[PDB]
Design a protein around this nucleic acid. Structure first.
Lengths: 108, 359, 51, 125, 543, 99, 113, 125
RNA sequence: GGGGGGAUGUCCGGGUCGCCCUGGGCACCUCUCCCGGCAGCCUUCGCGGGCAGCCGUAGUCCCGGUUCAUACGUCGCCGC
């Protein structure tokens, strides 16, 4: 009878909120979410939800791919790395593990 | 699981129509968890359930509907009744839940039941140990407590079990708020019964020692003030009130004297404790400022030992260097002091003897 | 969003059960008093002004 | 009266302290008292005040004036500090109902002045 | 102790790097040239340039663009700019919360700040206004990365904890908005040993953005955040906040007592520092008129709402669903009904400058409650769904009792005792039955005088026992409680129970990976809205 | 002074003074304990002044009057506070008899 | 005059550009004079102020070695006593102050000090 | 002073009211006062006691004797209990602060006791 | 702080009278484990756990006996 909606909102993680190329979008990575806002009107253009599930695994880092823009690299505390692309959502359901003990940081 | 209790209640109805009280009493003993031996604690009773409590009061007590009823003992000789008294289930909400049918038209129901019930317990037992146990066991409103004080003053005003409950009901009726105490006392008391009670409270005040001097409280002042406002001018309108206010002014001067002595004696005791600490450390040789003579200093200030920790910017805590401890000790010396070094110090064992000028 | 520097707000202390009202201060604000005596200390019969 | 108070306390007498208790000379008495002997005076005044609630119009001047001139000698006796810190604990317990007992003094100052009012009105009518 | 660092490259080769290490003691050490110092066994003497302005740990340090300026930000809510060509320093001083993260744009123009109160502002340089503002839910979070100034053993070490549930009401007349109590930042809220949440924000539920924010208790954003000793100041917490039936009033309670370290000179006899801080409490009861633009305005403030020899704690307030009336239960015992009258002293009304009259709230009714002292009492109240009866649970330990009071007359309609095992946590009134929780959870019908469902909850710690709470729906007759699964810490789980009014089976049993801090009921429709610790919001609906 | 109680700094505000300004703050405390609208803040300031500066009271005679003149007005403000709770009982008696 | 001593080294890269490496308050009053020396394995800078204490800072190892506060009291003791008469004695600008002590130390083992 | 007090409370004067308040006499005045102006007197005494704290003794004496003399005269009124309510409010504010003020009174009584002891020493020396 | 011991100094019955002891009063050094805090190093995502721990007091070669504070945008006069 009762149903539960998928979680929205989120707490902004301490990973740096990255600017897009040509400074028009801002990519803010929450816990369990990464969403792109526009700089001009301050309305969000996409919300890429991220399944986190193992009690405390957190999004460890996130950065634009320096080879090609409009990609990301999002990495958890356990071994998991996503290569999603903002303005779309291709890459959420296909992560790649890394065989760590616990992933403390990553930089691209 | 309502149907199981309904079948058990119908079986107890069959036992009632059989009029066999013994197996009914054993079934209530099994439920509450004849011989009927007791545990010796008003608190340590096992938890029972509300429907069996309601059925117990429904079978024991009774009501008369003539536009106003009367609780009566259908079972005036019952271990079930003394267990209800000792376990404190005889509350007005409990008996109203037991009698929702017959009382739903009745008004002033709390006043009627609170007037009727301690009278019923007192006519059950003339020794009123069951009334004192009810006073000590049940959640009691102000009507029940003023009727209980009426009962104990009917009994008095082998020979201490009544005065214990007389002490209990004063504490409970001091805990109650002013409005219900005044209205129930004005209802159920006569203006000479209140004078009897005010002589009992004077016996609790003067014999306790307040008017008495030394070389030769909050729970009784509430009762005295609530009785005085509950009678008012309609009851009285002699020298009794002048001697009354004389002894209350005497007790007030005693309490104010106790306030002054409380402040002075507490401050002198705290200074003596901290000065004992500082003198023990100065006898060890940590060389603090202590007062020498036997009068109190002007500022009741003792020098504490220097703490091992320091508060750095912005708020952090680090260890004190012994260098900085030595700097603060150099501040803590005076302008003249005799600092005797012993041969045991030069051997490396003991400490010095410092006698400094009194600042 | 640098918050603007606000000074310390004065305390709105509670007032007793007879405060000086707006109309009491409005009729106290008829401030400047000039008392012109009549000739030969005659009692004043009537003052008037046109509409 | 300086030398009667010295002998009455060393023997832990019960009667001879009371002979000096009822009778500015009181202040000049205890400024010359021996200080370890002065703590013996505080031990019995705290003994009678702790056992029963009461009052004493003369002892308020007595206890305070000894705790100033001879309170600095309280460091030498560890027994008396604990007796005074349980004494000032129970003197708080009398102090809790000062507000409720002052309201009782108000009603008696009300009713006694109203009972005298009707009695004067019967002689006035 | 290194809190952060930013490296800038000195250049299509890589000639050198310049490292700015922001340490946990407050300083920023600039190591000017590194590859030409460690390129060359033996090295020359390297010595960083120290830039010390922040008292606490510096949260973020970044070089700015061309490399002239070194921008930085710490707990002191100030974006600082080291000029670094001169010796000077210029700063944007009074933000909302701690500057938790900064970035610089690809061009030199924009900065982007992640402020600690769940926010991001893209600022433009030397206009210095936020050209882009994004706000979140700002509630209390159990953080993953713990803290940047919990590294060096301060006076009060910042602990990731939730001590009390979040104070939040969904507002009728606009059910998409949610009023909820927040502090300046998360770290500035939890710092000081007590929740200091002297603000509310209105948060859109249908599109999850923080719409607006306002102060309720006294706050000083433009003063220094930290005392001279090093403890962060605490601000008055808004404990009880509940909203009127109309959509036009709001009543809040905020408490503040001085800290325990501060007294030290008020102690005379048996008074400890906790007793002195409890004596010096300040409990204001403020009535707010909510405008159409979600702007709150004061109408009255009551300094001592429940008073005896000292001030008394106020345990709950409730709004009558049929009138504009707020009931408040105190520690003196009495329940007070406050109602709005017009300001009129002697027939001459006082009006606002536009012309409308000034309303003011005042105590319409006082009801003394009966006590039953068997040989620290807390309270709870709720109206009916109809009005006309107010249920008031009064709460000494195990013996506690509910009193059903009429509203039109001040007389007691009923009293019910013996229904509480421990200390009362809360009590709500669905259509006929009282749903109340202490150590037990009981649905108790008063039209039948009969308890339907009774549960003995599992024994847990005192923090979890404080963090259990419920909420009723009042449209579809269903209630919902919330309890963390058994001192609190980061990895805890919680499970909420959806019950109907009539049966004993839980109609939805769902556990959550983080502890939920608040449950609320949408007033227009059925269902609930729940707010988690790792602060995400999600809605539950039937159908 | 309420802002200096709320920001934890009243001890810091009072701890650096000299003799004449201690006499000035004592004179304000004595003059303004009488109003019960700020009796709490005024008594707290007097607490901190007693804890800080009760050691030089034999050193300077003029401060020894200002500590005695503040007890002299504190002694008259218990009598005002006891007479108002005496009289508050009589008002409480009359509202009971109206019922 | 803010009793502050600041140390500057040139910024790496551009020439003629200095910047403050670090500052510290070594004195207790203003720093009115200082002079440097660098030779025979000793690079110091001596700063004298208004608190009479010349403070020696290491120059080439600054931030690497502790400083040193030389005594403000003169090297000659300037305190002389006649022990048979128990007179202690000290002199400055044009006065000689002589104290007599009148008693032993064994007698005192505080109102008499 | 009964007719003067009647005039002042009936036409809301201030000069007559203050010149009769600044001054046996008080008992005769309240006994010859009209019954209907008693609530007006209560409100006009509560106002002066709030506005000025230094006049509490005489004003509590006036309120005390008024509540003695005209007790049932206020009950036969009874829709005007709000004047007694404002009076209760003013007296509650007057009796605010008592426990902390008693603590501070003890903290000062210790200093006064020590100063008087050193004066008693210095006079005899 | 307690539980306890080895040792310092002491009076009252004292003892063949000496080493001191038992009975009472005791203040200190040292040892011992529990009390409150602080750090390291392994384990686990965390929660917690494990290992060998230091501090609860006193004076230093010199010396952290330091480092640390919250902007601009505009001023003046009078009125409600």
């Amino acid at each position: 009878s009762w149903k539960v909606s998928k979680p929205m909102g989120g707490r902004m993680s301490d990973i740096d909120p990255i600017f897009s190329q040509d400074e028009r979008h801002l990519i803010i990575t929450y816990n369990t979410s990464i969403q792109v806002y526009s700089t001009e009107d301050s309305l969000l253009v996409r919300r890429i939800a991220l399944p986190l599930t193992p009690s405390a695994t957190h999004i460890v880092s996130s950065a634009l791919s320096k080879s090609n823009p409009d990609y990301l690299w999002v990495a958890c505390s356990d071994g998991r790395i996503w290569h999603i692309n903002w303005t779309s959502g291709e890459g959420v359901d296909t992560p790649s593990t890394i065989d760590t003990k616990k992933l403390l940081d990553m930089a691209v | 699981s309502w149907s199981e209790w309904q079948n058990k209640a119908m079986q107890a109805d069959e036992l009632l129509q059989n009029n066999d009280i013994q197996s009914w009493e054993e079934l209530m003993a099994e439920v509450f968890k004849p011989e009927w031996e007791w545990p010796s604690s008003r608190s340590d009773y096992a938890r029972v359930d509300r429907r069996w409590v309601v059925y117990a009061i429904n079978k024991v007590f009774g009501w008369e509907g003539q536009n106003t009823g009367r609780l009566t003992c259908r079972l005036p000789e019952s271990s079930v009744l003394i267990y209800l008294v000792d376990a404190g289930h005889l509350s007005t909400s409990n008996v109203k839940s037991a009698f929702k049918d017959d009382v739903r038209e009745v008004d002033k129901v709390e006043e009627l039941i609170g007037e009727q019930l301690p009278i019923i317990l007192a006519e059950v037992d003339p020794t009123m140990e069951l009334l004192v146990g009810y006073l000590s066991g049940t959640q009691l409103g102000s009507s029940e407590l003023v009727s209980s004080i009426k009962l104990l003053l009917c009994s008095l005003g082998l020979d201490e079990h009544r005065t214990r409950g007389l002490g209990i009901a004063f504490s409970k009726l001091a805990a109650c708020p002013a409005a219900e105490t005044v209205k129930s006392l004005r209802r159920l008391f006569k203006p000479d019964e209140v004078l009897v009670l005010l002589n009992v409270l004077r016996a609790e005040l003067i014999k306790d020692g307040w008017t008495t001097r030394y070389l030769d409280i909050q729970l009784i002042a509430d009762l005295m003030s609530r009785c005085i406002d509950a009678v008012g001018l309609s009851g009285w309108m002699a020298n009794f009130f002048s001697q009354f206010q004389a002894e209350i002014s005497v007790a007030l001067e005693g309490v104010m004297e106790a306030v002054r002595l409380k402040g002075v004696i507490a401050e002198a005791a705290n200074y003596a404790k901290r000065a004992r600490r500082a003198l023990a450390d100065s006898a060890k040789g940590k060389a603090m400022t202590v007062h020498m003579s036997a009068e109190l200093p002007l500022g009741l200030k003792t020098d504490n030992k220097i703490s091992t920790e320091r508060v750095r910017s912005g708020g952090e805590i680090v260890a004190r260097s012994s260098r900085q401890i030595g700097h603060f000790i150099s501040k803590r010396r005076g302008i003249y002091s005799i600092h005797r070094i012993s041969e045991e110090m030069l051997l490396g064992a003991a400490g010095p003897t410092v006698v400094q000028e009194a600042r | 969003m640098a918050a603007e520097v606000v000074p310390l707000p004065q305390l709105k202390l509670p007032s007793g059960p007879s405060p000086i009202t707006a109309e009491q201060r409005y009729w106290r604000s008829f401030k400047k008093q000039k008392s012109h005596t009549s000739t030969a200390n005659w009692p004043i019969s009537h003052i008037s002004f046109p509409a | 009266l300086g030398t009667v108070l010295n002998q009455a306390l060393r023997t832990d007498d019960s009667d001879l302290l009371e002979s000096c208790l009822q009778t500015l000379i009181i202040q000049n008495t205890i400024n010359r008292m021996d200080s370890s002997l002065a703590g013996t005076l505080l031990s019995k005044l705290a003994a009678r005040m702790h056992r029963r609630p009461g009052r004493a119009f003369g002892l308020m001047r007595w206890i305070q004036w000894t705790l100033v001139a001879h309170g600095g000698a309280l460091v030498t006796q560890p027994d008396l500090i604990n007796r005074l810190t349980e004494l000032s604990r129970v003197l708080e317990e009398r102090s809790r109902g000062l507000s409720s007992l002052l309201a009782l003094k108000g009603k008696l100052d009300m009713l006694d002045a109203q009972l005298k009012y009707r009695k004067a009105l019967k002689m006035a009518g | 102790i290194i809190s952060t660092f930013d490296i800038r490259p000195i250049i299509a080769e890589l000639q050198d790097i310049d490292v700015a290490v922001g340490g946990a003691r407050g300083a920023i050490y600039v190591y000017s040239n590194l590859l030409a110092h460690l390129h060359t066994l033996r090295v020359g003497t390297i010595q960083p340039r120290k830039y010390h302005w922040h008292r606490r740990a510096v949260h973020s340090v970044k070089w700015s663009g061309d490399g002239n300026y070194l921008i930085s930000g710490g707990y002191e809510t100030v974006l600082v700019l080291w000029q670094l060509d001169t010796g000077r320093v210029d700063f944007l001083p009074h933000l909302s919360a701690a500057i938790e993260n900064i970035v610089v744009s690809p061009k030199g123009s924009a900065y982007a700040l992640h402020l600690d109160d769940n926010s991001a502002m893209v600022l433009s340089t030397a206009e210095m206004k936020p050209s882009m503002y994004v706000s979140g839910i700002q509630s209390l979070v159990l953080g993953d990365r713990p803290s940047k100034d919990a590294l060096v053993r301060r006076v009060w070490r910042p602990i990731d904890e939730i001590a009390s549930p979040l104070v939040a009401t969904i507002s009728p007349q606009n059910p998409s908005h949610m009023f909820l109590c927040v502090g300046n930042g998360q770290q500035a809220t939890v710092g000081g040993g007590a929740t200091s949440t002297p603000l509310v924000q209105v948060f859109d539920i249908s599109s999850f953005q923080g719409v607006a924010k306002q102060a309720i208790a006294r706050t000083n954003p433009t003063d220094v955040n930290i005392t001279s000793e090093g403890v962060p100041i605490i601000e008055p917490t808004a404990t009880k906040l509940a909203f009127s039936h109309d959509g036009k009033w709001l009543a809040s309670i905020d408490e503040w007592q001085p800290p325990e370290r501060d007294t030290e000179a008020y102690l005379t006899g048996s008074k400890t520092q906790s007793d002195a801080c409890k004596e010096r409490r300040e409990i204001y009861l403020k009535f707010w008129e909510v405008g159409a633009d979600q702007s709150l305005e004061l109408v009255t403030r009551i300094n001592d709402a429940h008073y005896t020899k000292q001030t008394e704690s106020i345990f709950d307030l409730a709004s009558d669903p049929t009138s504009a009336r707020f009931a408040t239960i105190g520690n003196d015992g009495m329940v007070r009904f406050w109602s709005p009258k017009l300001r009129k002293r002697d027939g001459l009304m006082a009006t606002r400058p536009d012309g409308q009259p000034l309303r003011s709230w005042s105590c319409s009714r006082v009801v003394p409650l009966p006590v039953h002292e068997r040989q620290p009492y807390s309270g709870a109240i709720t109206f009916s769904e109809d009005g006309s009866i107010l249920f008031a649970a009064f709460g000494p330990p195990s013996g506690a009792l509910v009193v059903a009071i009429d509203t039109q007359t001040g007389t007691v309609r009923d009293v019910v005792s013996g229904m509480f095992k421990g200390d009362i946590r809360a009590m709500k009134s669905l259509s006929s039955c009282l749903i109340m929780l202490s150590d037990d959870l009981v649905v108790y019908d008063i039209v039948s005088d009969e308890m339907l469902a009774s549960y003995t909850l599992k024994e847990t710690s005192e923090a979890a026992k404080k963090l259990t709470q419920l909420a009723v729906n009042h449209q579809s007759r269903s209630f919902a409680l919330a309890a963390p699964i058994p001192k609190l810490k980061r990895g805890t789980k919680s499970e909420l129970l959806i019950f109907n009014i009539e049966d004993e089976e839980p109609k939805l049993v769902k556990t959550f990976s983080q502890v939920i801090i608040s449950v609320c009921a949408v007033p227009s429709s059925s269902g609930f809205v729940v707010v988690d610790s790792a602060a995400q919001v999600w809605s539950i609906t039937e159908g | 002074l309420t802002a200096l109680r709320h920001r934890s700094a009243l001890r810091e505000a009072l701890q650096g003074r000299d003799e004449l300004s201690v006499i000035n703050i004592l004179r304000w405390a004595g003059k303004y304990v009488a109003d019960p609208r700020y009796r709490s803040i005024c008594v707290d300031v007097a607490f901190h002044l007693i804890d800080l500066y009760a050691e030089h009271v034999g050193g300077s005679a003029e401060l020894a009057t200002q500590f005695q003149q503040l007890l002299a007005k504190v002694n008259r403000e218990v009598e005002k506070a006891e007479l108002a709770i005496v009289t508050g009982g009589m008002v409480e008696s009359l509202m009971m008899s109206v019922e | 005059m803010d009793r502050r001593t600041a140390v500057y080294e040139p910024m790496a890269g551009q020439s003629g550009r200095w910047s403050k490496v670090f500052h510290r308050r070594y004195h207790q009053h203003d720093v009115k004079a200082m002079a440097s020396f660098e030779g025979k394995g000793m690079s110091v800078v001596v700063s004298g102020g208004s608190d009479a204490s010349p403070i020696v800072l290491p120059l080439r190892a600054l931030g690497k070695e502790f400083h040193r506060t030389l005594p403000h009291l003169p090297q000659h003791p300037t305190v002389l006593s006649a022990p048979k008469a128990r007179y202690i004695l000290s002199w400055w600008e044009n006065e000689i102050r002589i104290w007599h002590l009148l008693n032993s130390a064994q007698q005192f083992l505080p109102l008499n000090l």
